[PDB]
Structures are given as structure tokens and as C-alpha cells.
Amino acid sequence: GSSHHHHHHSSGLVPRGSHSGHMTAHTLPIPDDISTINLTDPRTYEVNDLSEYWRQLRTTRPLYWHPPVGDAPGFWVVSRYADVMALYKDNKKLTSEKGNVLVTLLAGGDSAAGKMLAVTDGAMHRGLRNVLLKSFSPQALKPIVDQIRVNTTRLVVDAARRGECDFAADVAEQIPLNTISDLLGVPAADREFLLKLNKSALSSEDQSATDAWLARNEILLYFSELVAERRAKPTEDVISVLANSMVDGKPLTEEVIVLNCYSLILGGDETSRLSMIDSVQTFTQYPDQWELLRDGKVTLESATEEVLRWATPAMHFGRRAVTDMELHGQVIAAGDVVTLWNNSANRDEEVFADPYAFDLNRSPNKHITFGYGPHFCLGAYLGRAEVHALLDALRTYTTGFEITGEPQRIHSNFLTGLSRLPVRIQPNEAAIAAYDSDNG
Ligand code: HEM
């Protein structure tokens, strides 16, 4: 006996980690019936490959009436890119002011409506976007972007030296939220205070109902204290700009300014994470594309847009109809909730030649992973920068990587992607040495 092996028979597989997975990926059934799929529950995005579902809708039922599920009601499903683009543009005949996602739209409202940017229309929206325009311009964001790049490169290099890591928790969770609170102007000491306070605010399972409300309350109260320091000292950060500006003739109320600050920490976080996690997974699925990125045969800018188009973390956003509309001969009445499906739109063969090919040098690439029109993502440039920085770090300091355990999906009828991605990273060893002589 020189080298030893395990002894098994028809069983004997021990759990390695907290999961009990055996496969890198799973073949999901491709459904054919339209009525067999319920879009309300998250599970139907994890058990199904909706590729054929979405094209059946995109060719025969562009404006499809989804049936009522459990408690009322049914809703309109919009699949085609041109249709989705057109409805995003209309903030007059449609509104976000009664919610912009399935949960809020089907429940019949958003509690922050008329105050929070995403759920506000008319003059109030126009004014809120204008005061924040300069704060989100490339020029003002350049120091932020530069810091994102430093952080991402450090997190990737450490993950590369480590070799064995869970990409979600060790890299992806560690960029977006710290970026946005930096932009908001919270001190570094107060960051961990915000993180643990938000985690329970967004907890579900299982007097825990109000525990989440109090957690949210405390964040809002803390921001209100940072707001108070508007008069004390303006600081160029978003909190300061919002507290010291006025729209249109009147100053913004404590609740509004503070509620939008919180909307920034909600929106600046998960959706970027999901994109970053998705890119890494997709590179292991399409090695030639990864090779193309690593060997510098495609620009980071172009590659970034393809990763965004591929991931499409926010599967849908929705509106409610104020006045009656007529699309494709069919009637959309007042009160009806419409859902615009970005993930189907970024797979439309009408706009994207060979839609299910992951192509880093794809052009044109006019996706709608961010919105379109008035509600077009405020932090699109940030989302881009965070992906851009990851891609740049990856091609500089790694030669390749591989999925190491069964990845874990997030459960949402609205967002998609992974919460856990075990990877083995193969580091560019000589590149790290160059990073170590300069830094440290
Ligand atoms: C790649 C990641 C991201 C994706 C896929 C994404 C996607 C979107 C989409 C599709 C919308 C339109 C929603 C609607 O029309 O109702 C939107 C809006 C918005 N997003 Fe993002 N976003 C991302 C990153 C960010 C970041 C980093 C921030 C920074 C806080 C952010 C903050 C916002 C805000 C404040 C709005 C509301 C815009 C308005 O009401 O005018 N998002 N996002």
C-alpha cells in the first residue's frame, strides 16, 4: 500500500460544508405551457428555464394577462423589448406611485410612495432627480470610482492568494454597500452600525415583524441626525446636497430626504452584488469569453455591458395605469398593474442578434438592465463602475477560476442570481508580486 483511497460501496458520501451539494450546475426543464407558470412565487425561476416561456410570450402574447394568484389580483405581462422600452418612458399614463415591484403593486401600494424617488412621479420626481444630477455625474463620482477600484483589486488579490473562497461573501458583498454609504457621507465608524441594522431590517424568518420596523426606524433616525448637520456644515455628499437644496420653491422635509438616503442603501447593494457574482459564474460557463477578457482582446467597457445584459438582476419592474391605454389592440384599464420584464427584453432576438450567446464584444448592446426614461437607474454609472472594477481586477490578477461547490440561488420573484458561489481561483502569481512590491 503506497497511496490510500476511501472505501464506499453504493453509498458513503459525507457532507463537506454546510451545504450537501454535488453538482456545479443543474439542467432545468424548459416549460411549454404559458398557464402552467406562476410568476408571483420565487420558486418558478429556480425550477424552470424560462427561455421558451418568454419567447412564446414575445411572439404570441406580448401583453399577456397573468391570472390572479391567492389574494387578488391578476396583472399584465410585457415581454417585448420595444414594448418594455415604450412603457418605461410613459410616466404620465402609467405611475410608479403605487409601487414598482410585484409585492407592492399586488398589495396595492408602497408605503414610501410620493416621497421615495423610485415610487414618485410628476414634479416631485423631476426635482429630486435634478438636485442629485451633479452628485451622480462622472466628474463628481471619480473619487468614488477610484476608491471602488482600489477596494475591488484588494479584495480580488486577497481572494487569489487565498485560492479557496466563496466569491459572494468574500468579494461581492464587500464593495457596493460601503461604496454607497461613502457617497452618502456616513463616517467609517458608523458603517458596521448601519450594516447590522439593515440586515435585521430586511430579515424575514421567523415579535420579529416589528423588530424589522424598529431597525429601519433607527437607520432613518440616524440619517435624520446626519441631516441636522446640514446647517452645521455642508459636505458635498448626498445627505448634504438633499438637506440644503429645495424643490421646487420649498425645502425638502426630513422624511423625504431621509427616506431617499435609505432608498440608496437598498438600491446600491444587492443588484450590483448579483451582477458581480453572475459574471464570475458565466465566465466558467463560457471560458473562451473569459480568455478573451484576460488576454485583452476586448475592452472592459464593452465587456461590462455584456455582463450587465447577461445578468439582468432585476427581472422585472412594474407600473400602475392611471388612464386607459390601448396596446396591441388590447385594452389596459385604470388600476391594472403592468410588469415589464427586463430579463425577457435582454433576450429578445428582435434587438440582440443571437440572444443566448454570451459575447463580450457584442455591439450594439443597448440593454435595459437599468431602467429607461424618467426612472432610469440613478446609480447606473456606479453599477457599471463596480462591474468594470471587478473585470479589471480579474483579468489582471487571476488566470482562471472554477466553481467549487453547489451555488445557492436567491429566492425572489423580482431579483435573480446567487447568494453563495464557492470558487477556486487560480492567481497570476507574477502579477501579485508586482502588486506587493508597490503596495506593502
Ligand atoms: C447593476 C446593478 C443595478 C441594476 C441592474 C439597477 C437597475 C435599476 C432599474 C431597472 C431601475 C428602474 C426602476 C424603475 O423604472 O422603476 C433602477 C432605478 C433606480 N436605481 Fe438602480 N440598478 C443598479 C444599481 C444601482 C445603484 C448602485 C444605485 C445607487 C443607489 C441604484 C439606485 C437606484 C435609484 C435611486 C433608482 C430610482 C430612479 C428614479 O426613480 O429616478 N441602483 N435601477
Side-chain angles (χ1 to χ4, degrees):
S2 190
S3 57
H4 294 298
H5 303 288
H6 305 285
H7 310 278
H8 276 263
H9 203 60
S10 51
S11 59
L13 304 183
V14 290
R16 169 177 40 84
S18 70
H19 74 94
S20 295
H22 312 104
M23 307 199 74
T24 275
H26 296 266
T27 298
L28 305 170
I30 306 95
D32 43 12
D33 268 302
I34 302 93
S35 55
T36 200
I37 291 157
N38 173 20
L39 303 174
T40 304
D41 78 312
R43 292 147 65 238
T44 41
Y45 301 93
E46 298 178 63
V47 299
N48 299 306
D49 179 30
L50 287 84
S51 60
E52 206 153 33
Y53 170 83
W54 287 126
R55 58 161 288 279
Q56 281 194 54
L57 263 67
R58 220 151 55 245
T59 52
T60 55
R61 287 174 176 178
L63 186 74
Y64 154 74
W65 180 254
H66 202 275
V69 184
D71 286 22
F75 53 97
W76 288 111
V77 183
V78 184
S79 59
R80 292 175 176 181
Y81 174 94
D83 287 1
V84 168
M85 180 173 69
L87 291 167
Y88 266 124
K89 192 192 272 187
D90 209 322
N91 65 332
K92 265 206 161 177
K93 290 183 173 187
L94 290 163
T95 53
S96 314
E97 282 203 341
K98 290 150 194 173
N100 70 331
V101 299
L102 272 171
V103 278
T104 54
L105 279 153
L106 299 182
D110 188 297
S111 66
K115 298 169 188 173
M116 210 154 68
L117 259 166
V119 281
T120 314
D121 289 295
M124 188 47 154
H125 187 119
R126 303 282 166 175
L128 272 176
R129 275 210 79 102
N130 292 329
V131 300
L132 294 167
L133 183 69
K134 197 165 190 171
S135 202
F136 279 80
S137 72
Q139 202 272 357
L141 283 178
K142 201 200 172 177
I144 296 301
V145 171
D146 281 357
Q147 198 46 53
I148 290 165
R149 286 196 278 169
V150 162
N151 285 320
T152 307
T153 42
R154 181 186 47 91
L155 289 158
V156 165
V157 164
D158 285 341
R161 274 206 218 84
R162 194 161 142 81
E164 300 267 39
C165 88
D166 170 26
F167 185 83
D170 301 358
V171 185
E173 277 168 28
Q174 226 86 358
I175 288 106
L177 186 68
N178 298 343
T179 292
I180 204 70
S181 88
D182 194 26
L183 176 60
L184 274 169
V186 321
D190 300 39
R191 281 222 283 238
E192 297 277 16
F193 176 76
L194 262 67
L195 198 145
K196 286 194 182 184
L197 218 56
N198 190 48
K199 259 200 173 187
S200 50
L202 305 180
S203 183
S204 64
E205 298 160 330
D206 284 299
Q207 61 172 53
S208 196
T210 58
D211 278 328
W213 189 96
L214 291 176
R216 194 164 67 201
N217 176 226
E218 281 184 44
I219 298 168
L220 299 181
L221 285 168
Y222 163 72
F223 277 139
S224 311
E225 290 167 324
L226 284 185
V227 160
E229 295 156 55
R230 57 171 153 200
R231 55 192 283 197
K233 258 146 190 154
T235 44
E236 287 197 41
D237 61 56
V238 172
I239 293 168
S240 177
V241 167
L242 284 170
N244 296 124
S245 69
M246 48 179 68
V247 148
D248 303 315
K250 49 202 78 195
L252 296 168
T253 61
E254 163 155 283
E255 192 166 14
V256 170
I257 43 193
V258 154
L259 222 47
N260 281 308
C261 292
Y262 183 57
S263 81
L264 259 41
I265 78 98
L266 286 175
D269 194 19
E270 203 176 9
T271 187
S272 284
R273 282 187 278 148
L274 291 163
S275 306
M276 292 172 77
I277 299 156
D278 195 83
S279 73
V280 179
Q281 176 203 240
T282 312
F283 289 133
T284 65
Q285 291 174 10
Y286 298 86
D288 297 357
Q289 295 302 307
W290 158 250
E291 282 189 24
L292 199 86
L293 177 63
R294 179 202 60 200
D295 299 343
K297 299 204 197 73
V298 56
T299 72
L300 285 173
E301 287 76 18
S302 175
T304 294
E305 300 306 303
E306 178 63 341
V307 158
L308 290 163
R309 188 206 135 245
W310 197 256
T312 319
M315 292 181 296
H316 83 270
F317 271 109
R319 303 283 191 270
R320 208 160 172 183
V322 168
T323 34
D324 296 48
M325 280 161 284
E326 294 198 37
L327 189 80
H328 292 293
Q330 291 139 41
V331 195
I332 309 168
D336 285 346
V337 31
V338 295
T339 50
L340 320 176
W341 293 85
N342 309 317
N343 55 343
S344 179
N346 294 337
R347 291 303 184 275
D348 200 341
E349 60 269 13
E350 204 53 32
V351 171
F352 307 94
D354 198 3
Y356 289 97
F358 180 68
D359 186 342
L360 292 182
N361 207 47
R362 174 183 294 277
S363 44
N365 201 1
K366 303 302 150 286
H367 53 83
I368 41 189
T369 47
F370 306 111
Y372 184 91
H375 286 267
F376 176 91
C377 181
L378 195 73
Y381 188 82
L382 283 179
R384 275 163 183 142
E386 288 152 322
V387 175
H388 190 273
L390 177 64
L391 268 43
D392 184 40
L394 290 181
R395 76 161 178 187
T396 308
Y397 301 103
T398 83
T399 58
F401 35 86
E402 49 187 354
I403 274 81
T404 275
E406 188 190 21
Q408 182 73 36
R409 287 288 292 281
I410 61 154
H411 316 294
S412 169
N413 63 32
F414 158 54
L415 298 184
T416 201
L418 304 157
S419 63
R420 187 173 170 265
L421 183 74
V423 294
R424 193 203 297 185
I425 296 161
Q426 184 62 238
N428 195 303
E429 209 186 59
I432 295 167
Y435 182 86
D436 288 358
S437 295
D438 305 350
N439 309 295

